[PDB]
Paper text:
Hypusine (N-(4-amino-2-hydroxybutyl) lysine), an unusual amino acid, is formed by the post-translational modification of a lysine residue with the addition of the aminobutyl moiety from the polyamine spermidine. The hypusine modification of eIF5A is catalyzed by deoxyhypusine synthase (DHS), followed by the hydroxylation of deoxyhypusine by deoxyhypusine hydroxylase (DOHH). DHS catalyzes a NAD+-dependent reaction that synthesizes deoxyhypusine (N-(4-aminobutyl) lysine) by transferring the butylamine moiety of spermidine to a specific lysine residue of eIF5A. Consistent with archaea sharing a requirement for hypusine for the function of translation factor aIF5A, both the modification and DHS gene homologues have been identified.
In this study, we determined the crystal structure of DHS from Pyrococcus horikoshii OT3 (PhoDHS), with NAD+-bound, at 2.2 Å resolution. Similar to DHS from other organisms, this tetramer is a dimer of dimers with a point group of D2, generated by two local 2-fold axes that are perpendicular to each other. Interestingly, unlike human and T. brucei DHS, PhoDHS contains only two bound NAD+ molecules and shows a difference in the NAD+-bound and NAD+-free monomeric conformations. Two bulky electron density blocks shaped as NAD+ were distinguished at the interface between molA and molD of the PhoDHS tetramer after several cycles of refinement and were later assigned as NAD+. Those NAD+ molecules were naturally captured during the expression of the enzyme in Escherichia coli, since no NAD+ was added during purification and crystallization processes. The two NAD+ molecules (NAD1 and NAD2) are embraced individually by molA and molD of PhoDHS in a sandwich binding manner and insert their ends into the pockets of molA, and molD with 2-fold symmetry. Bound NAD+ is proximal to a loop (V288–P299 (hereafter named “the binding loop”)) that displays very different conformations in each monomer of the PhoDHS tetramer. Notably, in molA and molD, observed to bind NAD+, the binding loop adopts two different conformations (right): in molA, the binding loop positions away from NAD+ (conf), while in molD, the binding loop adopts another conformation to access NAD+ (conf). In the molB and molC of the PhoDHS tetramer, where NAD+ is absent, the binding loop is disordered or only partially visible. Strikingly, our structure presents a simultaneous combination of three different conformations at the spermidine binding site that are reflective of a three-state conformational regulation of DHS by NAD+: the apo form, the open form, and the closed/reaction form.
Residue numbers in the entry:
A (entry chain C): 15 to 121, 124 to 289, 311 to 336
B (entry chain D): 15 to 120, 131 to 300, 312 to 336
C (entry chain A): 15 to 121, 126 to 305, 312 to 336
D (entry chain B): 15 to 289, 312 to 336
The structure:
């Protein structure tokens, strides 16, 4: 006799946490979210007992476009993860949100182009967000170039993003305290982004280089692979928490290839594709807040 | 809308419900679940002031295969919905679960995703269905007319009441019979009930046990027409989503709609058709979405 | 070793059929379509040599809404399938298309204009008004037949009589109709929820205006009918477009014989097991002629049918 | 009120091409594929009559894993596209396939047995381990050549120059099999291949061993100067067309490069991700793309 499939009886359940504790028994994806909760509960309890599991967190730009950005930022502030891989949008949107917020719209594209509003699903980014971002990135580019001139070597993408967090601390106010990039800098959590020029930052850098005839500002990706892979190899155990697919999933999986794979994995994805590995199929905005709370906060 | 996109800061949030209270301003599907909570809350307060809103609840068999069955039954027990349309699996698996439970999976075992239904579940179901068929035929001879599918399912709850003990009180069919909530299922013979009916008819050379579907369209369509307002809560696609939407065309459309499904429209399908500030679709597995939605509507404050 | 993954070289490929003959070694869903072509070619050749394989064809309403309607009708005309299971829309829209065509639109004020939208397909309201002029006399014939026999028709008998009605009342248009050719060629069409659509809508009006409770459509006796068709066959094959009731009914019927002997499933629904998984078309079977092709049938099915039936 | 929804009648239709010529009026995704055929025929016919339309081709690694690799290579050989954006897998699997083919993973093998045998599984496609050993045989000397070029120029190569040099290297060291390679024909036809995350894959894995064992930090792959090259190719064009298979970095990069000019002038997207010179065909590109290319480029 195996585990009985049963949902919560709502006359007896006393909290939403209690409802969610039944998810491992509900079946389908609820069962997967239930398994994810208690895979991460091990890793977190094991970490708090001084056991070394290096936690790799990967996400695509939609994660940062959404309100999950604040949950990611908290995870980094509280040192719940050790290594981040994301996309160009995952970096720049975290910075931009520290300047002006994104706005909830509705999933009239011709009107949006006329009004200069960038739409991400049902989330709107007005044009002045990118102008404000340029005001900060152009001086950041000059600083990166001077650092490279002083070092006589290019910065890697992760060093670039590390320097971004240092730059955020110097130039921004209280808004930086909900920033992933800021807390990664403060807690020395590297952020890898092998395609950091594929977005607004790259567009900024295009104008900087076109205006100033610069070819000396270099972003290297060859030396980050050593840094990322070594972080997986030198760990006694690794865990993978990957939201979405694309470059971050592939990079984290590929990095853990060398040590024979990650030792624990939680995948959350809408892309149709032991007890220590699970994928939850669904939108991370629905799933991730419940997962984090049940692992980090639930009593 | 125009609200700033923002997630909860977990240094401040006190409970999971407060976390979920941010969903409307999180973006993507979280925003859709946030709007679904607002919609059903609005309908549920209006019902509690005595405002007539006829709630049509539709779901496919996978909902009943999952632990959501207990949540559906509670919603039926507490009269949160007025009309049910489901599929054959949605009916017969609710009965079967009141005899033996489904087993969580990764020898004659029926697998539904990661859910196991061992063969003795259906063997036990037949021990109840064969006498029930005899009762249905005896009813139809007494009435000199066939039972419609909803009448057949109502009679199935009465039979559950007489023949079963405690475990019927987690059952959707039982509570629908107890509360006189009609369950429509115009393809009731599509699964296990059909299989044993097949055995029943071969065994007794019977062609007199008739299940009519022509008269339930009057019953279901009139339930949509006669109400002042209707609300449509639909899990999945297929026959139930189509029947509830089709029934509500006779009144010009439902007044509130919450659809939860994993299907998409680009195959052109009903299951993927969109819900048309009182209409919303949440894309995802209902076993993840529905318990959050019901709790925040029926028990959050 | 094994089959080398390889696409056609377009300096050498002479025809689209030659391009498609590479699909089995292209990988992903293209490999599955290649396997589906091989499976149905096998079934069709065995049938043409006199071996008995009862072919079950299932499809959802969308198949008939789309231009696949003409391809299904040709399959039924040529008796490439023996049994059909569909939904209410799959029946009624085939009849309607014999009266007035569906119109190509785009994927929302159509409601005041009285235009029903199915994806990027438009059905103007006069299609249903015209359909009603035919259904009301048909309902009256159905009632007379049921009074004559003192028994109700099943859905399959109802649909068979619909085809006889089309033969009597229509001209050349019926020659593109699934319902006409199924009646004409003695191919049963099962539809266990035939009231869930426009037929049921007009039956509601017919029942309301006449205060009728006597027009009965039975579903309990077709399951004997449908299940015996699967049991008595020496072999069966299941070609199923989409999900819902038709997929479940054909698989459920074939449970009684230990599962179908050949299966080709085409659906946009992502099975739990995987889009590339073996298991999806292997369900309900108890024993390598099983394949699922993931995608829109309007893309896949015309290629499959041509390569199986017409490519030389 | 418009076009009548109608499929082909198989008593009349004489060819598969004739069957596919009904796709525009079949509805759903068939209609989108018919529209994609019309759009690309328009682009191609304009190009054949001298009109400047810069064609950006984007695809993810699954495209090159599959048999579509031969079709992409033909498009590049015949100069049907002007700019390529792909991923690391899209680059390195094209090179590997010129060494040893990929194998159809037709049977059911559990991944534990696959890993014992050293077989990498990509969907239903198998890459046996000796493919990567043979790849390393060629990539280590290529790394050494790249470093010498960098020392010679006193500057790093960008990713697109790296891939261009990969094509030159293929032409020097490989035989007839290179004639079915995207990288080779892009080099011969001076078609740039952009890949802003070229180290996230097998090339990156071998560079790791190269750098780790040689304590090298001098071999650089720059991406800052490629965004200039790519964006200029879109801004300097009179008109642009985008043909994008799948999502990920290539789709984002091509859309981003066309942002400055108000977007591409024609777009054909083919993807499985759930979202009149612009169309998306929802489905597997291995099903759709061979039909689209034949009907655009060869159906007469
Ligand atoms: N036009 C209409 O959709 C229409 C009209 C009248 C009646 N109805 C009624 O709607 C009810 C429910 O719809 P249904 O059962 O016909 O199917 P459905 O619309 O519920 O679709 C079921 C599944 O079929 C698959 N599918 C749909 N289109 C596909 C395609 N082009 N290619 C591949 N797979 C595809 C998908 O997995 C989908 O989830 C039925 O009772 C039917 O009679 C529908
Ligand atoms: N569970 C079983 O194995 C079983 C048993 C007996 C009978 N049946 C019969 O199976 C037939 C066909 O199945 P059906 O009509 O119940 O549904 P279906 O298989 O037609 O599913 C239709 C749609 O439901 C949606 N869906 C499925 N699971 C979902 C989930 N967890 N959350 C959200 N959306 C979800 C999908 O988008 C899908 O396209 C019915 O006639 C039923 O009686 C099923």
């Amino acid at each position: 006799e195996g585990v009985e499939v049963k949902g919560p009886w709502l006359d007896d359940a006393q909290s939403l946490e209690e409802v969610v504790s039944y998810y491992y028994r509900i079946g389908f994806q609820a069962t997967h979210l239930g398994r994810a909760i208690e895979i991460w509960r091990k890793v977190e309890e094991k970490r708090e007992r001084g056991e070394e599991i290096r936690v790799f967190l990967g996400y695509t730009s939609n994660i940062i476009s959404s309100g999950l950005r604040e949950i990611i930022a908290w995870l980094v502030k509280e040192k719940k993860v050790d290594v981040i891989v994301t996309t160009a949008g995952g970096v720049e949107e975290d910075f931009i949100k520290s300047l002006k917020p994104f706005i909830l719209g509705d999933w009239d594209d011709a009107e949006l182009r006329k009004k200069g509003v960038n739409r991400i699903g049902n989330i709107f980014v007005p044009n002045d967000r990118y102008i404000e971002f340029e005001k900060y990135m152009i001086p950041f580019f000059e600083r990166v170039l001077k650092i490279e001139e002083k070092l006589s070597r290019p910065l890697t993408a992760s060093e670039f993003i590390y320097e971004m967090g240092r730059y955020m601390d110097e130039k921004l106010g209280k808004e930086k305290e909900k920033s992933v990039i800021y807390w990664a800098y403060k807690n020395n959590i590297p952020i890898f982004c092998p395609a950091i020029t594929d977005g607004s930052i790259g567009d900024m850098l295009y104008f900087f280089k076109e205006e100033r005839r610069d070819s000396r500002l270099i972003i290297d990706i060859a030396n980050d692979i050593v840094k990322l892979n070594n972080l997986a190899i030198t760990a006694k155990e690794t865990a993978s928490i990957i939201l979405g697919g694309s470059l971050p999933k592939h990079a984290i999986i590929n990095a853990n290839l060398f040590r024979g794979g990650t030792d624990y994995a939680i995948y959350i994805s809408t892309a149709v594709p032991k007890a220590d590995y699970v994928e939850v199929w669904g939108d991370a905005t629905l799933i991730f807040p419940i997962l984090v709370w049940m692992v980090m906060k639930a009593r």
